Design a protein around this nucleic acid. Sequence first.
DNA 1: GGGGGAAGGATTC
DNA 2: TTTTGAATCCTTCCCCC
Length: 341
Amino acid sequence: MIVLFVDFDYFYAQVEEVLNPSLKGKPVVVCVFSGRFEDSGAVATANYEARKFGVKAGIPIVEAKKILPNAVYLPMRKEVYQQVSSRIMNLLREYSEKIEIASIDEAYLDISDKVRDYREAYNLGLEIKNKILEKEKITVTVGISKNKVFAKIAADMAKPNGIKVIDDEEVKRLIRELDIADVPGIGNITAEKLKKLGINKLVDTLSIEFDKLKGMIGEAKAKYLISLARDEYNEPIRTRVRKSIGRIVTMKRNSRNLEEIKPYLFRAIEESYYKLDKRIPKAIHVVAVTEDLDIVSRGRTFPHGISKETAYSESVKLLQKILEEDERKIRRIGVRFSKFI
DNA sequence: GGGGGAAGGATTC
DNA sequence: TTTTGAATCCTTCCCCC
Ligand SMILES: Nc1nc2c(ncn2[C@H]2C[C@H](O)[C@@H](COP(=O)(O)OP(=O)(O)OP(=O)(O)O)O2)c(=O)[nH]1
Ligand SMILES: [Ca+2]
Ligand SMILES: [Mg+2]
Ligand SMILES: [Mg+2]
C-alpha cells in the first residue's frame, strides 16, 4: 500500500496572506486573543518568517511581541480558514476515493490503485501540489510511504513547500535511527516515559518485555509502537466523522459563583449549537478549566437528542455537580456535545 | 473475567 | 501576566452480567 499525505504549510497564516498578499515576506502571527487584558492570549500559528525568530504556536502574544514588536498580528478566523480548507479537500477527492481528513490541514490519500511505485506516486504528489497552488494559491507539503505514520513523517521532514518519499529500505533505517519522540502520537509526557526505558528509538521497543512497556505507556501505545517497530503497521485510510462539537471560553476573571459563570456557559452553548448545525447530540458535557489549569468535567447522556433548552438546563446542573465536587476556582468554562443521532 | 459507559489524561491540531 | 482553544483516542474506575 502506498500512502500520500498532504499537510498545508503554515495554513492559518498562509490563508491570511492569500487574502492580503501585501503580507507576503513580512512575519505574520495569527493570534487567539483571550480578552482578560491587553494582548492576553497565545499564538495560533505564525508563517515561517516569524518562526525564524522564536515566534511559534503556543507562546503568549505578549512574549511574541517582545521578540517581533513590528510583526503583523492578526486575530484567528477559523470560519474562513475552514472554508478554504473544505475547498482544498474537495480538490484532493479527485486523486483518490479513499481519503482521510485528519485535521483542518491534513488528509491521507490511499493511492494504491492509482500508481505503482514511488516514482509514479512522487509525480502525483507534484500534480497535487500544483493543482492546489493553482486553484487556491496555497503551498503544501506531501509525504509518501507504505503506511500513514511514515507518510506523515515524510511530510514532517520536507515541509514547508516540500515533497518526500520514504521507501521500504528507509522505513527500516528510521525504525532504527529516527528519534522515537519524533513519531506521530508520541507527545512529551510519553516521550519521557520512553526516552527513559532506554527506548529512544522505535526498534528498542522490540527488546523490552512487553508488560514493562505496557505498564508504562499503556497497552494501546505499546502495541502501536511495537507494530511500527516490526513494520506491520497498516491502518486503513478510513473516513473520519466528527464525533463531538464544543466550545470553551475564558472568563473575564476566575470564579466559582454560579450566576457569574452562567453567561459564559450559555454563550458556549449558543455557539456550540450554531456549530452543531442539524446534528442532534444525545450527550452533553460541561468542561471547566480551573485556575491551576486542570480540567474537570461532568456529563450526561439522554436516550434522546438534546434540545437547546435542555442543554441550558442540564448544563447548569452539571456546572453545579462540578462546583460541588471541586473547590478550586474556575478560569475556563465551556461545553461539549456528542453521540449524534 | 470482561463488556460498556463516565471522568481524567494526553496528544495534537 | 503564560496560557488558547478544540477534539480525539488512551487509560482508569466503577457498575453489572
Ligand atoms: N487555535 C489553535 N490552533 C493551532 C495551534 N497550534 C496549531 N494550530 C492550528 C493551525 C494549523 O492549521 C494546524 C497546525 O498544524 P501543526 O501543529 O501540525 O503545525 P503545522 O506546521 O502543520 O501547521 P501550521 O500551519 O504551521 O500552524 O493547527 C494552537 O495552539 N491553537
Ligand atoms: Ca500544516
Ligand atoms: Mg496540521
Ligand atoms: Mg513528539
